[PDB]
């Protein structure tokens, strides 16, 4: 990245993300009609869209449950943001899975991540990351977890849900190439699962305790094996002050200053 004025322009662009949050499109096509259905609360959806960036992808774990006497539908009741740094085509989450008391009552349902532009297929990077997470963590059942992709289309956010088939799981768990077009990736590895919005219930967020979630500016400080404790709160903004300490802290002090400054009495105080 340029990192000199590109971040300035991107911050200015991200300041208008809340306009996208009223033009949302759901891709209801190629859905197999046989799997689960998923319900995403609009409050957490809008907060996630607002706190994101137009270029560097962000991602967060989903937790949810099933409504009483309706186990084939799953309500997403929580989103967890973890110390991460991402590029325009991938997100480098830490190996540790979220662990907290409140989450113990909900069953993990996958993860949701942003996309700079819409694409008609699940990317090799996303499939391999999903497979790696599932293999590393036994709690991630391959039939209930999914991937939710939010693509920033012109003046809108298009949401699409994808599920990983066993063949894709094996290919991802074995693959090691992080390039855009690895070998052995086929459209049979994933399938579309039905996802819809809901105004009837509200979900919540969970952010790290000691630090914030966005490390993009503090890239060096992040490690995949980093450990973190959670906390019940709401996320900050991508370009929040805490997330870019360099811009605010790299200044200098005052030495012999205010010596030739103007004289103006603050009469009111």
């Amino acid at each position: 990245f340029s990192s000199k004025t590109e971040w300035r322009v991107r911050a200015i662009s991200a300041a208008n993300l809340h306009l996208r949050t009223n033009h949302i499109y759901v891709s209801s096509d190629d859905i197999k009609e046989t799997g689960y259905t998923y319900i995403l609360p609009k409050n957490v959806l809008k907060k996630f869209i607002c706190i994101s960036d137009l270029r560097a992808q962000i991602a967060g774990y989903l937790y949810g449950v099933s409504p009483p006497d309706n186990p084939q539908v799953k309500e997403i009741r929580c989103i967890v943001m973890v110390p991460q740094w991402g590029t325009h085509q991938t997100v480098h989450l830490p190996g540790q899975l979220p662990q907290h008391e409140y989450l113990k009552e909900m069953e993990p349902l996958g993860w949701i991540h942003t996309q700079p532009n819409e694409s008609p297929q699940l990317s090799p990077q996303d499939v391999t990351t999903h497979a790696k997470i599932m293999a590393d963590n036994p709690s991630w059942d391959g039939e209930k977890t999914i991937i939710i992709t939010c693509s920033f289309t012109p003046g809108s956010c298009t949401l699409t849900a994808y599920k990983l088939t066993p063949s894709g799981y094996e290919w991802g768990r074995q693959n090691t190439d992080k390039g855009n077009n690895p070998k052995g990736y086929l459209p049979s590895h994933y399938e579309r699962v039905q996802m819809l919005l809901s105004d009837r219930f509200l979900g919540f967020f969970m952010v790290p305790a000691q630090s914030s979630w966005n490390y993009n500016f503090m890239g060096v400080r992040h490690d995949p094996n980093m450990k973190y404790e959670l906390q019940l709160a709401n996320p900050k903004e991508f370009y929040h002050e805490v997330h870019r300490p360099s811009h605010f802290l790299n200044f200098a002090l005052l030495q012999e200053g205010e010596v030739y400054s103007a004289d103006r009495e603050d009469l009111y105080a």
């Binding site: 200044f251 030739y260 103007a262």
Partner: peptide, 14 residues
């Protein structure tokens, strides 16, 4: 806490 040079500019700052 930066330090400025132009007198009019520091007057405006204050």
């Amino acid at each position: 806490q930066l330090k400025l040079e132009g007198f009019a500019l520091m007057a405006d700052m204050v």
